[PDB]
Amino acid sequence: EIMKYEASILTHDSSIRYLQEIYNSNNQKIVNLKEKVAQLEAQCQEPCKDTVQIHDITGKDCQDIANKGAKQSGLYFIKPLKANQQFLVYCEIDGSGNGWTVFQKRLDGSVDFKKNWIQYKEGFGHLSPTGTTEFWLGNEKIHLISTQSAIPYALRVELEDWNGRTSTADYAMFKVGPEADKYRLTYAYFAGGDAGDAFDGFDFGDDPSDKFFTSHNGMQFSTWDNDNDKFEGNCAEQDGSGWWMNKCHAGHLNGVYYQGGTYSKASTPNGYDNGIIWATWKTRWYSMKKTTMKIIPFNRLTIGE
């Protein structure tokens, strides 16, 4: 009769029809959403970009390399005339054409210079591409790069403070004794620089000898745990540090990196000086803010060319 109206509930002939497309679309859709990944992952393949990077040119010391090209004061693998595993140094090239090299540095307080002999030897702390970064290339290293056929090097104590000014203290015929004779330095003379020369002793008045001892020239290296100084024991350890000791010092670049500098009779662990002092510039309480000690082949103090 009219029941043949079921041809009405024959709507699904589209209640399913249309909807169906909303299926055949997705599949086809995903064909597209494939490459929309095939490509994304083809990007997520490389690692993060790193700042620090090793230049290729190498050779004897920073100078040698940076005389075979070079100009960017950064990081190169050197390998002393006589040595083995070419280590990594933080050169500091100039305009004239000379390439210094560093064995120290100080700015933040980070690399804590209160390490041990084996550490002060093979060198410790972390370098950097720029330079900003406390570090101690380490006595050992400092050797093979100062006694390589021994063409007279030099030290260039640089400075600054919590007030502006900086300085410079020079020394010729630079060298550091092989671990044998210990890590005792061996230079000839102070050579200018308003920096001052506290490596030649400084009388603090406490006693005439307040200067015979406090000399750093010729004084072997006294880590906190292995002193070769001239004290009733290990000076270093006393004020804590690893620095060419005597009974004790006058000029500390490996010591207590004090904030705002100038310390007192309070931060004195055992009681005496340890801060970043240097009597031929500042007293025994003013702790320097910055500090660095680079070398370079002697015939450069009046290079001319």
Binding site: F204, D206, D207, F231, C248, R284
Partner: peptide, 4 residues
């Protein structure tokens, strides 16, 4: 510095 100096000591005792």
């Amino acid at each position: 510095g100096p000591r005792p």
